[PDB]
Amino acid sequence: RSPWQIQQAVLFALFLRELKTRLGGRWLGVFWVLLEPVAHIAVMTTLFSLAHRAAMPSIEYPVFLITGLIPFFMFRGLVTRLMEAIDSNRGLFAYRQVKPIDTVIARAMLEISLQSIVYLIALGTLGWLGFHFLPVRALELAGVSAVLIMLGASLGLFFAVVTNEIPQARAIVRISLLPLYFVSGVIFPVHTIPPQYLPLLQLNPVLHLIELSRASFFPQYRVLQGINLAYPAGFALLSLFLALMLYRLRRHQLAS
Amino acid sequence: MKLVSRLTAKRLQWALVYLPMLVATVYFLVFSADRYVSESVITVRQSREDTCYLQTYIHSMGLLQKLDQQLKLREHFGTPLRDPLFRLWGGTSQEWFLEYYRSRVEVLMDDICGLLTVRVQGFEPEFAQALNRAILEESERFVNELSHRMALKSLVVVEPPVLPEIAEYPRRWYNLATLLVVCCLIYGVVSLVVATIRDH
Amino acid sequence: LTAKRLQWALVYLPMLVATVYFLVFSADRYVSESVITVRQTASREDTCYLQTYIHSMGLLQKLDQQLKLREHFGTPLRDPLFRLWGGTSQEWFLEYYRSRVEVLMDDICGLLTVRVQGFEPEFAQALNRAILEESERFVNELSHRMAREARIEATRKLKSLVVVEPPVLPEIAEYPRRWYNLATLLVVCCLIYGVVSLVVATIRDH
Amino acid sequence: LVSRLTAKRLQWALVYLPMLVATVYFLVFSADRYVSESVITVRQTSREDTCYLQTYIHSMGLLQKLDQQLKLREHFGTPLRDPLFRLWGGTSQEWFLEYYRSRVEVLMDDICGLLTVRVQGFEPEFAQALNRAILEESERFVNELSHRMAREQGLALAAVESARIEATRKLKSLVVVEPPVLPEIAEYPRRWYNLATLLVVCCLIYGVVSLVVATIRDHQ
Amino acid sequence: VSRLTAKRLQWALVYLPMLVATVYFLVFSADRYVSESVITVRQASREDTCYLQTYIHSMGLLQKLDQQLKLREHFGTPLRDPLFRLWGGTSQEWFLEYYRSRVEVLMDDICGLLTVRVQGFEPEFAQALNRAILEESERFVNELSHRMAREQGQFVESARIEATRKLKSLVVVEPPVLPEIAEYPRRWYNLATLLVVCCLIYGVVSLVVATIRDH
Amino acid sequence: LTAKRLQWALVYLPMLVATVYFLVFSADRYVSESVITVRQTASREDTCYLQTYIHSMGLLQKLDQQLKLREHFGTPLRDPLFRLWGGTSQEWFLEYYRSRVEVLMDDICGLLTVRVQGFEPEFAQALNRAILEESERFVNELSHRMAREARIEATRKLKSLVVVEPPVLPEIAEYPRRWYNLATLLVVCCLIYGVVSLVVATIRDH
Amino acid sequence: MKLVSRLTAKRLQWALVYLPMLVATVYFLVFSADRYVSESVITVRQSREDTCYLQTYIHSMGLLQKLDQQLKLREHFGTPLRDPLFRLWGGTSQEWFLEYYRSRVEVLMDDICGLLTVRVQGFEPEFAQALNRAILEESERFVNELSHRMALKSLVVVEPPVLPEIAEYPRRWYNLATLLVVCCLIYGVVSLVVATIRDH
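Above: the input entities. Below: the structure tokens describing the complete assembly.
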């Protein structure tokens, strides 16, 4: 019994366990996880169409909004479901050959698969409406998406390990995520905000990731200065190292 | 239920990974044909309306008929018999000819200068440069005729069409790499779905 | 008695009738496309008047006097859905004409594109040309009536119609794009089947 | 085979191999790249003319003129010890254009509309000369673009006189805020900063990999 | 080997940098006086003010100021401060970086006023450098306008009356001042920042060394 | 040994020293307030110049030559916190003057309000009047220098200072509003006590 | 904690509901004094800067000194000896006089018209109308003087000051009702908090 084999078996078990819980009992979760993006699409199209037309006459609103909204939804889902993974299956650690990290990575892969399915469905329904869906540079987009996924999973694991035995922290990080919806500039193009507050907004790694994903997805998309991938990449690597180290230090204390 | 139980990993691997790689490699390294690109950057000056009219006119049908009369695009694009995908098959419809031509010449526009860049593809570099030059000349004649028909303005060529040395669009290694990434992601997702429906 | 019977009905039967209609009964309609705009000697008002005027009733009466659209659109006996049935109301005729002629504005650049359907390519080209000529006559006649309240101004060419792309003569018919409609109908019927099956399971559970 | 990967092999490969390769390349094989910086803008007697210049600096026609004038292909192939930032002989025109676009960096300041051109060369004199040639050719291009319409323009004698004065006049001249500078030392090959950053990144990557390996191993 | 890290690690990594920094900032540091002036350009003025903002930090202005005031010999005087002084033989690029660090230009978008703060090792030298900067900037805007007008008019009365006048003038809201106490360096703020970063670094290495020590 | 001792210290002792300083040692400072604006014969740039110039160093030197602010602000020996100590630096003197003279812009209506503190009401009024006169002289002198590059223009009154409210002569001193400061300090010390008590309980629990 | 449980209910009831209402009813029904109001609506025309200057000038100190010289506001406002709160006590400071005057005259201006309305309070209706008229006349003289000092413009009176018949500001019943609401809410919150601290 190699450790990889039992790890894969428990991951598949834990994975389908998270699936059953997250998806509806009547096989209906696809309905709401497809309804969440379209409502935001409708309200932002009915609220900011002419503003985007005044912004730039080059890229239409639906595809530009989807290509930033779906990665942000994946990031927020990764953080939220990852930080609550350990304090949701406390009765599961009674059996041996299981660890909290198995639960957190099962939730991570479930969220990744669900959001990938939603992204593919949105791209298909966008191409069915005569829009532009094919990425011009797909490899850079894949790399940016991988970096964003790693950053989100790392932040979720860090919040899961750090905020054990204090649920109240999980209460406040949600209110830290609401302004991040508007700070990241996913809805409106960042080219319109004046530079007077740009240097404070360049410290958001997801902002850099979203602009780089849009640049790699669209042909002839202008990226402003200081949107290098180096800063979010280093942020993700450092946070992942810190979270893995903190989990390794507080290993036996985590499972109880 | 019985057919999804008959299915295993190895047949899924062969039907999703190795066979697409075999056909893609066979097509790219043997069947593909080089497509040289000529790039030009122009604007219209005595005015976003004028370059908007120009951008609509480049992909129009009358310009396509004029260029077909001049340089015989249909005869040129049917030459690469080796490539079945990017060649213009003889006896095809007028609408497919227009779609093929619109795919071949790509027109882009920036919002903060109004500069209009055109990239014309061709199977011979001299033909690509000639097609770009003919497009520019016809555009200049069109805007001058539009000015004269009302009863002044001339085209400014920031960058005249280049003569390419090597083709750039039929990229094989980058396409193979992104196909590998997409195929791996699709296999992983569909294998997770197969595993979770089989367990049910 | 839903079982698989409602699945069989709501999936196969609309799909079966749609396939047997599109693959045999449907008649293809050629399309002539032109792109125009209005310029002086601001200009967006002339284009918006043209957009309202092309889908009007007086222009339809003029075109019926000219080319007899009513007798042309009743030609294909094979197609019973896209054929203008003989002896119909004027309102239904106007709705049919508005469905067969599509006018799209592009917000920037002030360009109005007209796509005219017809059961013959030459007829579609002729109809589009007649529409363009009558639109130019209309935008001239408005300024003529304005200046006829003097005689020097009321006879000139105050407004000219700029034709970026003249109407084209199609070789094959773009519509009715049967495969796209079949795929869309299959997808939507699958969605209705899913929601109906789930609500039926919920009802029968109670 | 998770047990096949030991701590010694992971250490050796992941840390020492890229660090040794980078150290050898940066301290033995890398070549200096001096950079000359100039700051310009174009004034009449707007934004359109300077963004036209921004497009034109990277254009292929300017590259052909500069290659005729200064023999860029011969100069950019001299450093033989550096195989990464040298222009290999017998390369395509497209690769030559990409190399030229990489060696010349153009930054636009939109709050003031100022164009900063930084030109890299393997000698300070060559970088300064290339920047001077770029500035001169940009001014000549703007002048010719303005002159072309008035040249194509040509009672009637008044129209002829107006056409000739418009064609002969010097309409748009770019002013220089900072003329090209002759550098003293090369600044773009940053050996120590790159080496320290790569060392830190490799250490973090090894730590992450080792922790993941230990977590995988903890399933007995 | 790993069984040698203890409270002594905290001792070294925290208090040794604190002692070194305190010793350097308390006696070995050199006083740096600051002279402040506030100017603007007036007979489009935003364009000229932005031109000046770019021109202050330019290399040509630095060369002119070196030829006029000998900045190299002045900035190399405090031999007791090896960190904030300009070493002999320092290259031109490092000299430009040092000059850009020693001169601060602040732009305010609302009122359109340009603030110049010049650091010198003597109270008189800071004011002299500020005055030289102001005079050179006024000469620069005048020379730019004159050169444009003359190159246009070398092709007539308008040209020769616009090529010799004073089209551009510098409005000095606050003339350069003469300090008497060194504003810089901020010893206590720098010590607090170094203490915070040393505490964070110590915490990081403490958790790392707790992780590796776990077998 | 926190117990109630840290509560007693961090609450009473700052409160005790603040009360014994404000109720006895503090010296009240009278305030003269005026409201002005700059009009021609656009105008916001002159008021921006005035806002920058009032808190400058050359104007401070002029006012020190005129009214000797340094000897006036060192008068109250009783107050050791708000008194300008003798033999201080010019930079500290400038910061003290900037603290004792407050200039506020109102964004709409283009109004600049100046409030000048002083240990005598007549001195505060005189200082505000001198500030207003020197500001008018400065905005005139800028245009004089502008026109001295002809001689007819360089002698006129190109800019005039409109005084909506002239400086007033206070009867009583508004500052230092001891009760407000005491209440604010009590509230903030209570907040620090609460957070310190929570963190001390957390630390001692471990 | 011994006295914490000693607040019980009836002591809290008394000291938080009935005594404040006893003193409020006693003050309003006996001690209060009527304050008549005169309302005017003016604008300045040949211009938001001008009515901005006027709005600043109404509450200024120089206008207060001019009005005190003209109509003797300090003598008038000290008459209601019965009301100790809204009367101007003799021998008070200049700053308190300015604050009292600024409380007595309320200046308002709509943003979509620029109309400036003033409401002047006084213990006699004729005095309130006279104060409003003097304010208007001094404002007109001020804007004319400001125009003349540079070397044209006149005030437009949409609604001249009225002569009130009855006072309107010392509303006794509405104040008693809002005191009822506020007192009940303060009771409820403080009683819940005393219950939870006592239970601890």
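Note for the figure: Strands of chain B lie at 36-45, 105-109, 116-122, 154-159.
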